[PDB]
Structure formats: C-alpha cells, structure tokens
C-alpha cells in the first residue's frame, strides 16, 4: 500500500538532513532554512528498532542438530536427512526472502505520507488567505518569520487569519 509521496510529489529531496530522517524545509524573507521533525523520525527509528528486536540479536539457541555435511553414500536415511535439511533450507530461504520483501515494502509504505498532519494543522489559517495549497511545498500565505516555522515544528500553531487576501 504505497502512499505516493517519497516517490511522488516529493520528487528530489535535499541531502543535508543528517540529524533526522524527515524535516520541514522552508523559505523566509530572513533566509530559507531547514528543520527536522523529531517526532516523526523518532517514530520511524523506533519502529525500525522494533523490527530489528526480533531480528538483530535474540536468536534461537539451537545447540545440537543433525549432520548436514556428508560423505560417501550410506543408505536411504542419509537421503532423508539431506532431503529434510534441504527442505528446511529452502523453506527458511523462501521465508527470509519473503520476510525481507514484506518488511522492505512495509518500511517504504510507512515512511510515506503522514504529512497530512501538517496539512490539517495549516488548513484553518490557510483556508482563507488565497485558499488551499497542497502540491508538496505548502505555499503558506501567512506572512511570518522563523517563529511561525518554529511553532509549526513545535505543533503549537494558532490561527491568525490573513483577511487582506481573501480571493486574490
């Protein structure tokens, strides 16, 4: 279930975000800076770590098993041992390939959208001043400075309506 943002309307992306996975790039009269939303990238890193808790470390302590490396042929029981070992390896290799496929697909799918929160946050003060922007850069007509982008980052944004431009 792709959401069509990271391959969609986020077409290039800027390469400098070393502190976080996501960010809030902007352009102001006092300088076009950057951001990093710690909540969203923290959620993403937490779910990656939760994925790797079942994977990285805490394996199954399988101590004694059957002999898999073989030699000159002995009987049908050696053929059965080779067959059960090969079917276990094929099942586990199919299962690991499937697990990689589902978790890579799910990682791409969840690390995608969740930018509707910014949309609905910006709506009620963006609905009046030159109406609604959603094309990937929020062309926010709230004439403001880095304090308003700080409030958008902080998720503490009020709605000071800009009635100077109602239609154009």
């Amino acid at each position, epitope marked *: 279930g792709i959401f069509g943002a990271i391959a969609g309307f986020i077409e290039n992306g*800027w390469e400098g975000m070393v502190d976080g996975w996501y960010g809030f790039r902007h352009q102001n009269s006092e300088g*076009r800076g950057q951001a990093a939303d710690l909540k969203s990238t923290q959620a993403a890193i937490d779910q990656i770590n939760g994925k790797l808790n079942r994977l990285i470390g805490k394996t199954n302590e399988k101590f004694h098993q059957i002999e898999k490396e073989f030699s000159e042929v002995e009987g049908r029981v050696q053929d059965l041992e080779k067959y059960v070992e090969d079917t276990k390896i094929d099942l586990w290799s199919y299962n690991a390939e499937l697990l990689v496929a589902l978790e890579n697909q799910h990682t791409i799918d969840l690390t995608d959208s969740e930018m509707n929160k910014l949309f609905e946050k910006t709506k009620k003060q963006l609905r009046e001043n030159a109406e609604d922007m959603g094309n990937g850069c929020f062309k926010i007509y709230h004439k403001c400075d880095n304090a308003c982008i700080e409030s958008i980052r902080n998720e503490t944004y009020d709605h000071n309506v800009y009635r100077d431009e109602a239609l154009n």
Partner: antibody
C-alpha cells in the same frame, strides 16, 4: 575525504578585480551550502555571504553590498569569489567554508585560505 | 545587527586543568551557537553546533552549553594540542556574527 581545496595567493592593484576558487570534493555539491569567512590578520572572523549550489540563492552581509559576489559551477563542483574595487583595507585571508542548509549555518567543514594582499 | 562579544581577551591554564570559556550575545539567540577552533598555523575547525552537540571526530573532552544570551564552552582536561584561539558564532538572524576571539595560552 571532504576537503575544500583552495587556490594560492594573489597580488593586484588597488581598485582591481580578483577571482578566487574553492574546489569541493568528496560530497555532493548541491547538498550543503557554501559560506566564505574573511579574517584580517590580528582581527576577528567575519561572515560575508552564502550561496545555494542547487539554484544560486544569494544572501550577502549588509556591509558588503556591491563589493563581494558569489557564483558556483555545478559541473566542476567549484565555488567562486569575485571581488571588486579593492582597497588596502581588503588584505585578509579568505576562508572557504562548507555550510549546513539555510539559517542554521554551522560550518561543518572549513578550508585553508588564500593570502590576499592589496598594495601598489 | 547582533553585537556579539567575547569579554575574556586571553586566558592561561596548565595541562590537565579544567578551563571554562564563555561569551555573551546582545540579544536572545535561542540555541544556535558555533564554536570555532583556529590553530596558529591556520586550520579552522568547528567544535560545538546548535550550542549543545559536538562535531563528530572532535574529542569528547570538549563541552559547550548555555541558553538565552549567556553561553559557555568547557574543556574538562586540557592537553598540548588544545592551544588555539576560540570564536563563538551566532546564526539566528542574517548576517552571522563571530565572537571577538580569545587566545588560550599555557601558563
């Protein structure tokens, strides 16, 4: 290795023009910004301007309008400094510095500097 | 323009001593400060970015903190390679402004 290789020293007439260079390497040029820092000997560090390697956004210091200009060449990964109307007060060491995007502006990688001297 | 000042012109400390260096901004510059180390040969290096976190590769003995207008940089245990001049930088409003500088010497 991220190193901003820089040119040598120059010596020109007062009132002449010079063009500096700073070759970026080891990293993608359009990612991080370029900033240049002037240090007169015995004086403090001064910030003169910033550029955006992706689309050439220009922001300059207030005291240096019409005097310092910023250009880049995205093909060669190079940041250029053209100076105009030079005076004896202009003699300094110009440091080419990398820069994190926008107004955050922490210069994660610095350069070596060019000894610019103005005399007759 | 933010007239940004380093009050301590110079300071001396011995090897292994805990030296604390500080600087003050004329206004509230939030939490964006940059500490620059200039060795006497000419190599500049940035130390503390965003007034709390340190650049990777810098030894862990360097530490800078502060909030509001007053900020400080603390070196827990000095060594021989730490002899340099230190500049502190604000970055909130254009243009960026560096500190007055302070040349640390060995007593």
């Amino acid at each position: 290795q991220v190193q901003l290789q820089q040119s040598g020293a120059e010596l020109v007439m007062p009132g002449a023009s010079v063009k500096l260079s700073c070759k970026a390497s080891g990293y993608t040029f359009i990612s991080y910004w370029m900033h240049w820092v002037k240090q007169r000997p015995g004086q403090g560090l001064e910030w003169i301007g910033e550029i955006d390697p992706s689309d050439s956004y220009t922001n300059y210091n207030q005291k240096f309008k019409g005097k310092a200009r910023l250009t880049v060449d995205k093909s060669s990964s190079t940041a250029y400094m053209q100076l105009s109307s030079l005076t004896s007060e202009d003699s300094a060491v110009y440091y080419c510095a990398r820069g994190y995007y926008g107004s955050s502006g922490y210069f994660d990688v610095w350069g070596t500097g060019t000894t610019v001297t103005v005399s007759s | 323009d933010i007239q940004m000042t380093q009050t301590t012109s110079s300071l001396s400390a011995s090897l292994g001593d805990r030296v604390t260096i500080s600087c003050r901004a004329s206004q509230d510059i939030s939490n964006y400060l940059n500490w620059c180390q200039q060795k006497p040969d000419g190599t500049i290096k940035l130390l503390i970015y965003y007034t709390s976190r340190l650049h990777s590769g810098v030894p862990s003995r360097f530490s800078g903190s502060g909030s509001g207008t007053d900020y400080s940089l603390t070196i827990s245990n000095l060594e021989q390679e730490d002899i340099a001049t230190y500049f502190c930088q604000q970055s909130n409003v254009l243009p960026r402004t560096f500190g007055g500088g302070t040349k640390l010497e060995i007593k």
